[PDB]
């Protein structure tokens, strides 16, 4: 699922965002195939609500919005 | 003239946010601030619906949530 969303927005994206979201999706894929094998939930949002920690004063936030949608 | 009404319910909600918030940082105090106030939007936002995101800048309804915790 993360897969095959990220690849119907991997444009539009804000690089940081880009990379961030490329990076991640690729190390739950290195992550694949352990025995210990997990999603970073709560690691991946609050990353991203970092990211709104530096946005959010002004809700011109949209793209972001739309990628921390 | 309105000023009186806007201080109330917005300060009422305020404190509702900073005593919550507080509860949040004890919860998990290692966790920064930033995160945490957007956090606490997307908590809002996710339960609550984006219908009342907007309603996040009306003193009233967030008022009226954040006591209905």
Redesign the interface.
């Given at each position: 699922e993360l897969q095959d969303i990220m690849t119907s927005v991997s444009g539009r994206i804000p690089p940081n965002v880009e990379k961030s979201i490329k990076k991640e999706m690729a190390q739950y894929a290195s992550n694949i195939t352990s025995v210990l094998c997990q999603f970073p939930s709560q690691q991946i949002?609050?990353i991203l609500?970092?990211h709104?920690?530096?946005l959010?004063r002004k809700s011109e936030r949209e793209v972001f919005f739309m990628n921390t949608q | 003239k309105t000023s009186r009404t806007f201080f109330y319910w917005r300060l009422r909600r305020l404190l509702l946010e900073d005593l919550v918030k507080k509860k949040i940082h004890n919860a998990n105090p290692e966790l920064t601030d930033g995160q945490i106030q957007a956090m606490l939007r997307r908590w809002f936002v996710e339960v609550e619906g984006t219908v009342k995101a907007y309603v996040w800048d009306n003193n009233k309804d967030l008022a009226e949530w954040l006591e209905k915790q």
């Open positions: 949002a609050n609500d970092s709104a920690a530096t959010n | -």
